[PDB]
Ligand binder design. Structure first.
Ligand SMILES: */C=C\C(=O)Nc1cccc(Nc2nc(Nc3cnn(CC)c3)nc3ccc(Cl)cc23)c1
Length: 301
């Protein structure tokens, strides 16, 4: 294979400042904060994921390795780690949080243009991961984050290589096999998640019954807003024969074609008269000294 020449950047604890907590969990915690490279005259918005027990520091470093190895517009890119008593991952702050919560809170303002554009953007992200011979193994709406409403990025790699049952292929649930095509399956579930505005797939059914249900030939329903054209693509992702499933490059193509005429393929009431925040808005840039702020996407080496 060719050699992984990614640079891992070690940052000083004084070079950035946490500002608030965004969430707490098993790992530890995630802070909204600000990274000022010393002597650079830039302030960069970041998220800071911090942890201590050795056999779990190995896991955080592993995620960091993965995330330093990727560079694509639709993959959240890591900026550096900071070595203190607890390891801390510094990555580009994604201001609107996870897409799953985003569609839940904003159902009434999400148009078909936004939906299909998301579907394209993720198909691109995953196609890039496939180029980089990477398998995600945990692709879901909870693991896509929202930079702007018009820009989402894949962001959890705590399971990537070279258990979330209701998102996984059949070969994966039964034989622990994972390939790019089982990632396609989870892409299909994800799409379902979006088109149902954050619904829970197989709500109620305990994850132990999932394997046998799928075995019989049952799948998720057709979201009300879906034409058959979109639902058919979801369904092709849920074939048993993994080679019968579409390849991410084709998913990109099909959702592109659909996102040219969005209202021919998703029927939403009040569509086209809907507004979400845009970088061409007022106050769109606040979350008090934004003098010299630069989005990470534009600070390079
Ligand atoms: C989808 C599930 C979810 O909400 N996860 C969650 C909650 C809180 C914090 C994070 N991590 C995270 N957050 C941001 N920015 C953010 C904006 N609004 N919120 C609260 C909804 C969080 N940006 C990130 C960039 C990269 C990484 Cl790896 C994580 C985050 C996730």
């Amino acid at each position: 294979e060719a050699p992984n020449q990614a640079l891992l950047r070690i940052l000083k604890e004084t070079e950035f400042k946490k500002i608030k907590v965004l969430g707490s969990g098993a790992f530890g915690t995630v802070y909204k904060g600000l990274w000022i490279p010393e002597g650079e005259k830039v302030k960069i918005p970041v998220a800071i994921k911090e942890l201590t027990s050795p056999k779990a520091n190995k896991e955080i470093l592993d995620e960091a390795y993965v995330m330093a190895s990727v560079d694509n517009p639709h993959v959240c890119r890591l900026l550096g780690i900071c070595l203190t008593s607890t390891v801390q991952l510094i990555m580009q702050l994604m201001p609107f949080g996870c897409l799953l919560d985003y569609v839940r809170e904003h159902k009434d303002n999400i148009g078909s243009q936004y939906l299909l554009n998301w579907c394209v953007q993720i198909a691109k992200g995953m196609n890039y991961l496939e180029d980089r011979r990477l398998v995600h193994r945990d692709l879901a709406a909870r693991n896509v984050l929202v930079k702007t409403p018009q820009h989402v990025k894949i962001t959890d790699f705590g399971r990537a290589k070279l258990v979330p049952i209701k998102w996984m292929a059949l070969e994966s649930i039964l034989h622990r096999i994972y390939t790019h095509q089982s990632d396609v399956w989870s892409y299909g579930v994800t799409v379902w998640e979006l088109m149902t505005f954050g619904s829970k797939p197989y709500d109620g059914i305990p994850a132990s019954e999932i394997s046998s249900i799928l075995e019989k030939g049952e799948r998720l329903p057709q979201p009300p807003i879906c034409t058959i054209d979109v639902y058919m693509i979801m369904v092709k992702c849920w074939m048993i024969d993994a080679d019968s499933r579409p390849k991410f490059r084709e998913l990109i193509i099909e959702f592109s074609k659909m996102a040219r005429d969005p209202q021919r393929y998703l029927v939403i009431q009040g569509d086209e008269r809907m507004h979400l925040p845009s970088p061409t808005d007022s106050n769109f840039y606040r979350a008090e000294d934004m003098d010299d702020v630069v989005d990470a996407d534009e600070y390079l080496i």
